[PDB]
Structure 1
Amino acid sequence: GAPATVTEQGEDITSKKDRGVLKIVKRVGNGEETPMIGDKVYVHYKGKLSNGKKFDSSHDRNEPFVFSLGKGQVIKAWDIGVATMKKGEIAHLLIKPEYAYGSAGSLPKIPSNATLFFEIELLDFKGE
């Protein structure tokens, strides 16, 4: 599966290099420019828990997901991962609980020590 490809071949994009966020680019985006901290960011995504028990998509809501990069408005893995993406790119992220919801989790939706996979498409990013 898509997760196992990332676990195998996938780029370690953490600063500490602890394999905590792993990345494969699936469709290459456009321009040399990736977003700066603070940028307003527009994505579509699909996401799941590795346990296969929960799934979530921006499409279930019929619209892009929007947030300010690097404000901790998402999990650390998104602030890291999306910062590496070009306009128009689709990537896969596989994420250790340390860069998601950790030992506490976020019950009931996310258990203690959960691993998460996302597919992300970066639609646009505008400046603060």
Structure 2
Amino acid sequence: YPNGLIVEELSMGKPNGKRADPGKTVSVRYIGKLQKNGKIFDSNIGKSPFKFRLGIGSVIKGWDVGVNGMRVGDKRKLTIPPSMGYGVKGAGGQIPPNSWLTFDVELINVQ
């Protein structure tokens, strides 16, 4: 297992697409999964866009680090250690304690 977060480029969007920088409100399409078994716990595909302010710590740390630097249309895979996810708490009744997480993410907009 990695010492920290792994971020993989799955595909590149627009070369001059707006860039996700700290302080921006960014809009992301995602699928979240438990890394240990691949079970999917959430997606917003076909639902409303998920917006968050990058860098303020409202999302798990793996997202604040992992989404940073994306340009619109980029797709990334995030592999997130427990300390950069929900740690001993878990979440949603869906993520057990001490879970490694995987997310597929696509940047849709930057505001």
Give the shorter-chain TM-score range: 0.7 to 0.9
RMSD: 2.0
Which structure carries more helix by proportion? 1
Q: Which residue of 1 aligns with 2:98?
A: 113
Q: Which residue of 2 aligns with 1:80?
A: 65
Runs of 5+ consecutive residues of structure 1 not aligned to the other structure: 1-6, 8-17
TM-score w.r.t. structure 2 length?
Answer: 0.85
Alignment: residue pair count: 109
**Aligned amino acid, residue 75 of structure 1:** I
Distance 2:79 2:22 in 1: 22
Runs of 5+ consecutive residues of structure 2 not aligned to the other structure: none
**Aligned amino acid, residue 4 of structure 2:** G
Cα 1:103–1:67 shift into 2, 3 Å? same
Q: Percent identity?
A: 39
Larger Rg: 1
Larger RCO (CA under 8 A, 6+ residues apart) = 2
Cα 1:64–1:33 shift into 2, 3 Å? closer
Q: Conserved in 2, the CA contact under 8 Å of 1:54 and 1:109?
A: no
Alignment partner of 2:42 out of 56, 63, 66:
56
